[PDB]
Amino acid sequence: GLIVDTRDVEERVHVMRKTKLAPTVAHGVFNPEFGPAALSNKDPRLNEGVVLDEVIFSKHKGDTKMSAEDKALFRRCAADYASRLHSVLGTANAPLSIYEAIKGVDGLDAMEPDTAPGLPWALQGKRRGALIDFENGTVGPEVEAALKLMEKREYKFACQTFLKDEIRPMEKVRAGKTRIVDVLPVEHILYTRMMIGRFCAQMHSNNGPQIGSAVGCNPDVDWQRFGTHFAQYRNVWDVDYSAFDANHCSDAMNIMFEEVFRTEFGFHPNAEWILKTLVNTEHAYENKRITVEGGMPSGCSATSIINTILNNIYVLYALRRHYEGVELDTYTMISYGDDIVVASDYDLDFEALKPHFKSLGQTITPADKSDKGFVLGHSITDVTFLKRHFHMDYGTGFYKPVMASKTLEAILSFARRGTIQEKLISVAGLAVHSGPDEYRRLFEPFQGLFEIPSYRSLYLRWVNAVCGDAAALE
């Protein structure tokens, strides 16, 4: 988005720290071009002389303002998508009773028991459980207060800013491209799902090429569902954005909320508000406290949904801004946050869409970095969604998600002390689709040191998930 002022005031939020990820026995075998993100502005590997802070906030290249016409077009693309959305989700998007907004409902998972409470709960020292009784299902001291200042529309907050302790490609590592996570005051999160937690519930439940959402899916089995649907079309695109979240122009966000969360659909008239509050944000990075217009903060709940909705509107907006009478049925797509896959029998020219996406402030580019030219013909077995490729299972004919071996090795090369054993299991689930040989190889350097799930043990478990009958009938 756009920085309106970089200031230094009073306190200092200590986010400075080390990485807890650590090389495993695997690292000394695969030696991945991957490594932990720079967490200290003086990290020994920072490519010569570059500042951490400098890089981190350099994604806010500004906030694209739109022409009254482009606006009206977006508002039309929203009124159309938001239509076909609720028309399939029903208007069961009413609010949530406090209790539900904590324990979740059929679909929506229960709020996070205890993770970074945000501001001002930290410049005060204490947990979420130390404010809200998570075991119970209701508020607390300052909680119900904030809850009412919000209820009356008085509430205003500040976004805490975290650092992403994660594995990244050695290049981006040295470039100092450590990602940040705006962790908001937990009451804001609570009221958000109280406003649209029911909307999100249905969202998760009906994920698919229909509503164009992937949020709430289980890639391990929904890959068959998805795979087949995208096997009908002529062309398949694997679009790629640059800081998708950070570049959502103020006008886009404000207009999307307005059109997608109307009381006309059963929402509360404070849905539009609580969402509009996400536009102009204040971020506290140590002693620094910055004001950021535009762009959506990656950290708040519903983030993936909001981004998905956006991503869907952008595709309709962009196309109409170049084609003749484009309708939602002209194409088909499905996105998860910013990750996206589009399909259409028409031979659309995404290369001619860079501008129309630019009008929104989104720089689009093809995934497979080859000749960076939006080519055609591409099929389901070229694109990569959620870092998982669509592979035909030569054993059951069903599709299975395969992560590039390299990328997998990276996951196995770094693990915080002692978690190895449980991760090796989790990660093992992801690697079973790389075949039996690559499975063995990816874990080969672990035998006699840990419990490696037999290749059979997992294949069979996956089989009775993609199609429970297919397991018995065979």
């Binding site: 998972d109 594995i167 990244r168 981006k172 790629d240 970095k369 390299k406 990328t407």
Partner: peptide, 15 residues
């Protein structure tokens, strides 16, 4: 390449 890296997240946590 772009800021878009290959080894990070996938979904929030379990469904």
């Amino acid at each position: 390449g772009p800021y878009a890296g290959p080894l990070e997240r996938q979904r929030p946590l379990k469904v």
